UniProtKB/Swiss-Prot annotation:
It is found in: Nucleus, Nucleolus. The modification Phosphoserine is found at S54. Pre-mRNA binding protein in vivo, binds avidly to poly(G) and poly(U) RNA homopolymers in vitro. Involved in splicing. Acts as a receptor for carcinoembryonic antigen in Kupffer cells, may initiate a series of signaling events leading to tyrosine phosphorylation of proteins and induction of IL-1 alpha, IL-6, IL-10 and tumor necrosis factor alpha cytokines. The chain holds residues 655 to 730 of 730 of the full protein. This is Heterogeneous nuclear ribonucleoprotein M. It comes from the Eukaryota. Sumoylated. The modification N6-acetyllysine is found at K25, K51. Residues 8-82 form the RRM domain. It comes from Homo sapiens.
Amino acid sequence: GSSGSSGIFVRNLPFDFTWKMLKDKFNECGHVLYADIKMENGKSKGCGVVKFESPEVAERACRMMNGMKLSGREIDVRIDRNASGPSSG
C-alpha cells in the first residue's frame, strides 16, 4: 500500500443504500477499502466514494457498477481523480 490508490464516485443512489451496501455491493468487483455516503445539510444525497487495492479494480467497477439500477434507480459510477490530498506539494 501507499503507492497511488484511486477512489471512484457514485451518484443517484437510493436512500436505503447504506454505507455497508456501497462496500459489500462493490465488494463483488474487488476488495473495498473505503466506503462512505457523502451527506449534505444532514440529509443524504445518494452520493459516495469507494477505494480499491489496485488501480485497475477502481476503474473496473466503474464499468461493471455504472449502469446498475438499484431498486429502479440508475447510477453513474466514474473514476474520481485527485479525490483526497489536502497538501499537494
